[PDB]
């Protein structure tokens, strides 16, 4: 169940020869030279990308139905499950009486990218999408409104739908 780590003329001469002639130092140098002659694992960014998964948590997006009509139904589960309180929702019924949203703001400098909103959405409207290269220069640009989220959804629908099709049976 347990073991004792570090509990251990020819041998004395071998130790003295290792002292004077540096046997184990030569061994360590040989391993260093072994690692010199291998193929380095540097991938050619940005022309090459690291491996990922269809479950990758990236940029927030708002999806749509396959008829043009938006998916969010103003149920406020995402802002109730959000651990960082980064989601602000204000809702009202529009002209046709459909329960939709008027303000859907995500503070992306508050968001912790944990995917609770993408799993608490009953109609799969909000999705933590796949995009990770969305660094900005100003603080206000990382403060998405509803129009930016809808534009991101219409931008990345062609792969978000495929990722959902690939992953939805594990949920």
Partner 1 sequence: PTVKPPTARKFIWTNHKFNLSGTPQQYVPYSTTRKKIQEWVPPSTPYK
Partner 2 sequence: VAKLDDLINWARRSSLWPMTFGLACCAVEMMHMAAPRYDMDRFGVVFRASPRQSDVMIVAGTLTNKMAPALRKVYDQMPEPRYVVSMGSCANGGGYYHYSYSVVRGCDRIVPVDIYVPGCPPTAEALLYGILQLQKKIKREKRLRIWYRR
Partner 3 sequence: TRPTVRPRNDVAHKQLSAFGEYVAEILPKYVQQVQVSCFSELEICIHPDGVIPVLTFLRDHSNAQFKSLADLTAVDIPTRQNRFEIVYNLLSLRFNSRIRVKTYTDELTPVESSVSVYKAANWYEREIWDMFGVFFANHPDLRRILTDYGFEGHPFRKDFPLSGYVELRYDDEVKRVVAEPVELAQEFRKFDLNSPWEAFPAYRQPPE
> Is residue 71 marked as binding?
no
User: CA 121, CA 117: separation in Å to the nearest integer?
Assistant: 6
Residue 24 as a binder of partner 2 (CB under 8 A): the answer is no
**Residue 42's binding partner out of ligand SF4, partner 1, partner 2, none, with CB under 5 to 8 Å set by partner kind:** partner 2
Torsion of the alpha carbons at 77, 79, 80 and 84, rounded to the nearest 10:
140
* Three-class DSSP labels, 92-132: EECCCCCEEEEEEEEECCCCCCCCCHHHHCCCCCEEECCCC
Which of 116, 51, 41 lies closest to 78 in space, CA to CA? 116
Residue 123 as a binder of ligand SF4 (CB under 6 A): the answer is yes
Q: What are phi and psi of 70, to 5 degrees?
A: -70, 155
Q: How far is the CB of 85 from partner 3 (least distance, A)?
A: 6
**Residue 149's binding partner out of partner 2, ligand SF4, partner 1, none, with CB under 5 to 8 Å set by partner kind:** none
Site for ligand SF4 in 93-122 (CB under 6 A): 106, 111-117, 120-121
| DSSP state letter for 65 | -
> Is residue 152 marked as binding?
no
| Sheet hosting strand 143-144, strand order edge to edge | 87-93, 99-107, 143-144
Are the C-beta atoms of residues 115 and 86 closer than 8 Å to each other?
A: no
Selected from 17, 43, 80, 123, the binder of partner 2 by CB under 8 A is 43
Q: How far is the CB of 24 from partner 3 (least distance, A)?
A: 39
Residues forming the site for partner 3 (CB under 8 A) = 80, 85, 88, 107
Q: Which range of residues in 7-15, 71-79, 137-145, 159-167 is near ligand SF4 by CB under 6 A?
A: 71-79
Annotated binding residues for [4Fe-4S] cluster, written as ranges, equal 72, 75, 78, 82, 111, 114, 117, 121
Residues at the contact surface with partner 2, assessed by CB under 8 A = 40-43, 45-46, 49-50, 83-85, 107-114, 132-139, 141-142
């Amino acid at each position: 169940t347990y073991k004792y780590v570090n509990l251990r003329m020819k041998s004395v001469t071998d130790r003295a020869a290792q002292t004077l002639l540096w046997t184990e130092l030569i061994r360590g140098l040989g391993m260093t030279l072994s690692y010199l002659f291998r193929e380095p694992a540097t991938i050619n960014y940005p022309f090459e990308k690291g491996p990922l998964s269809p479950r990758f948590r990236g940029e927030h997006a708002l999806r749509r139905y396959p008829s043009g009509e938006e998916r969010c139904i103003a149920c406020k589960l995402c802002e109730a499950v959000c651990p960082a309180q980064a989601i602000t929702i204000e809702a009202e019924p529009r002209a046709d009486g459909s329960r939709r949203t008027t303000r859907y703001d995500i503070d992306m400098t508050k968001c912790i990218y944990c995917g609770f909103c993408q799993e608490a959405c009953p109609v799969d409207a909000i999705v933590e999408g796949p995009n990770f290269e969305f660094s900005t220069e100003t603080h206000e640009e990382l403060l998405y409104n509803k129009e930016k989220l809808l534009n991101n959804g219409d931008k990345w629908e062609a792969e978000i739908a495929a990722n959902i099709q690939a992953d939805y049976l594990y949920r």
